[PDB]
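Follow-up to my post from last week.
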Amino acid sequence: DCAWHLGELVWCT
Amino acid sequence: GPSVFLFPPKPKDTLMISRTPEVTCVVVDVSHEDPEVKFNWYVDGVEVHNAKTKPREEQYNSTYRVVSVLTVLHQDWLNGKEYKCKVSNKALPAPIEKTISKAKGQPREPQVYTLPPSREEMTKNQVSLTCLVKGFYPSDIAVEWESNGQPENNYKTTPPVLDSDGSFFLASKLTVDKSRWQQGNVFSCSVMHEALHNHYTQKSLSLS
Amino acid sequence: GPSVFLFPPKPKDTLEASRTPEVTCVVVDVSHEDPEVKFNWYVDGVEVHNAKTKPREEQYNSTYRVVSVLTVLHQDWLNGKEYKCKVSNKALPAPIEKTISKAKGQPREPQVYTLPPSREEMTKNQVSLVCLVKGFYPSDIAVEWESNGQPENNYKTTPPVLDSDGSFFLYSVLTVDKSRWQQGNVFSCSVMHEALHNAYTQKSLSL
Ligand SMILES: *[C@@H]1O[C@H](CO[C@@H]2O[C@@H](C)[C@@H](O)[C@@H](O)[C@@H]2O)[C@@H](O[C@@H]2O[C@H](CO)[C@@H](O[C@@H]3O[C@H](CO[C@H]4O[C@H](CO)[C@@H](O)[C@H](O)[C@@H]4O[C@@H]4O[C@H](CO)[C@@H](O[C@@H]5O[C@H](CO)[C@H](O)[C@H](O)[C@H]5O)[C@H](O)[C@H]4NC(C)=O)[C@@H](O)[C@H](O[C@H]4O[C@H](CO)[C@@H](O)[C@H](O)[C@@H]4O)[C@@H]3O)[C@H](O)[C@H]2NC(C)=O)[C@H](O)[C@H]1NC(C)=O
Ligand SMILES: *[C@@H]1O[C@H](CO[C@@H]2O[C@@H](C)[C@@H](O)[C@@H](O)[C@@H]2O)[C@@H](O[C@@H]2O[C@H](CO)[C@@H](O[C@@H]3O[C@H](CO[C@H]4O[C@H](CO)[C@@H](O)[C@H](O)[C@@H]4O[C@@H]4O[C@H](CO)[C@@H](O[C@@H]5O[C@H](CO)[C@H](O)[C@H](O)[C@H]5O)[C@H](O)[C@H]4NC(C)=O)[C@@H](O)[C@H](O[C@H]4O[C@H](CO)[C@@H](O)[C@H](O)[C@@H]4O)[C@@H]3O)[C@H](O)[C@H]2NC(C)=O)[C@H](O)[C@H]1NC(C)=O
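User reply:
Got it. Predicted complex:
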């Protein structure tokens, strides 16, 4: 799973 | 003589895989007579070679400012590696060394809690939405607000405060027109921190 | 040469009739060969003679620390009077002057709002009770907590933050055992500020 912030990629585990 | 200042990456840059974190060795008071500066870089004692020098900048006070930038990996920084910049210049009896790194200590996950306005604020033209972020270590963090995918920019955030259990807390206050709060609009607190799942959590808040 | 620092009185001291507010003039790096420091105080350019010198104090880094303390009146400080400390010493080419006073600009009354713990916090051992203090100027303030006449000490308060309307705000957070909150106890947030009625207000919070 992945986190996004205002469209931009944050991090994925 | 010349003096050195060494700065960490921006929290956001170390936390967002799509951004590029860098450490910055800034050398001020560089003389016109001897402007040549040599930089050595070390990551945990081991020398690296991928540093790049930014263009020289002449200052209003007759000195040069020379700046060397070292790109770093996210996880090296987050794993707490130490970055040393060594500066040599003719007008300097001996080279100057400076070391920086993440704050030492086990990282703790921030607890993120959104809080509606007081019933007492409801008289006023504008209302306060509060994001309480407590129990995080180290103090490196980013807090932003949004609504319907769009950044809400009318907020302010306290600097991190050291708590009695050794972690940090802060609060972020977003001020909206009361009418927008009444209109059922959902607001979101975005928190970025190393010890969160995927470096990111979001907490929402709307008229109850 | 010596260096000088001039400190304002404590917010609480200026705001409580019973306490005694003072301006403090500190001289550091006073030499062993010339320890004598002359102080001259002025209040709005008018020299006053009621300052009292503190005991001279050895710093053990080759220098003395010499302090002069001038008591001030509540209203004088609040009405924005300016305080000047002039320091003279043999190791100064020229006397050093410092001036301090209240921050300038129309005082604004703080809005005090108390915020209950989040439903999500209610699973933890302890909960956070929040006191949002906004809309105030100047930033000179004090915040305290209590319950049933007794002081609750387990809190932290952020420093004042400048807001987009030129006023200041802060948050104070009291952490209590969940049980104490659950069982219906009243907790109170006490705020002192020159622009409050009677320089004081209190807001309360309970389940
Ligand atoms: C001749 O003039 C020069 C330059 O002066 C400038 O212009 C003149 C006309 C005046 O207006 C000056 O006021 C101007 O600054 C003088 O150079 C100055 O010397 C000072 C000391 O000698 C030095 O003070 C130290 O500042 C530290 C903080 O510096 C910050 O913030 C200031 C302003 O707050 C800013 O101007 C600085 O450039 C610096 O900014 C940071 O830079 C870094 C690196 O670029 C940024 O980090 C990077 O950011 C990028 C993105 O851009 C990316 O994200 C990277 O990942 C990241 O690495 C960072 O974001 C910037 N931050 C900000 C807020 O802007 C203090 O911390 C430090 O204090 C420490 O040490 C002290 C002892 O000296 C202690 O007291 C203290 O406790 C601390 O430990 C210093 O005070 C000035 O910064 C410096 N100015 C510049 C521009 O270099 C020079 O002195 C003078 N010479 C003579 C002979 O008169
Ligand atoms: C020899 O040593 C001395 C003493 O140092 C101590 O001992 C040595 C051996 C070491 O162990 C040190 O670590 C010890 O501190 C050295 O003296 C120091 O010199 C510094 C600069 O030369 C000077 O820096 C300036 O500090 C200002 C803030 O000082 C505050 O806070 C510090 C701690 O943060 C504290 O130590 C100071 O005493 C002072 O504390 C305040 O005292 C006032 C007055 O008493 C209090 O106000 C009163 O409170 C009472 C209640 O008790 C009452 O209510 C009154 O009404 C009220 O007025 C106040 O509450 C105290 N505050 C706090 C937080 O505790 C800075 O503001 C200043 O910065 C400004 O200027 C800079 C440029 O110079 C700017 O960069 C900056 O941005 C600012 O504009 C300076 O940083 C140290 O204070 C000073 N320390 C002491 C104890 O005097 C000496 O240098 C050394 N000599 C040599 C040759 O090495």
